[PDB]
Amino acid sequence: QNPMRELRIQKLVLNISVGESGDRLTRAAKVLEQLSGQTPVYSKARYTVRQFGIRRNEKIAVHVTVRGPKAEEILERGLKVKEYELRRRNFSETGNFGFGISEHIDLGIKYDPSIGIYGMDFYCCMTRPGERVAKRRRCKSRIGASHRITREETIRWFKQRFDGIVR
């Protein structure tokens, strides 16, 4: 019996880690603005390391989150680049998955020389309906054993919906 346990897309989170401060961030931020439609966020280097050449509290990366039909269509563009094929090792034991691309214009952005070329990281998180119980402020609790997702379901769900393949 599965009356209402159909998976959905809570959100899609994507990030770019250039690894060095300066105007590269500002132009990289502009990329996310045109792609998503929202305004992005700046991170802060937690631990300084001379080797990589980064100091603490120095912005080095950007990311944005999307939910709803926008998330669906952005995910669809990404998978079209990846040829509707993923590796079996891209799925967590808890039910999540993600991947990455190499050059940001495998989809349509109509390259301009005044920006450059970048790469993006996609990570997509599943869930079952009814997870407010673990995020509401009053009378919080943990979802029961039976009602949590494991790795075999998500790959099963992914294969049928997109008619993909895993190696």
């Binding site: 931020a29 305004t39 937690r46």
Partner: peptide, 24 residues
Amino acid sequence: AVEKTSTHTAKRNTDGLPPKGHAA
């Protein structure tokens, strides 16, 4: 255009690279 507030805490007044000591 907004700055994320890191959850992680660090010693109030220290200027140290992360102490690892493991692997190389």
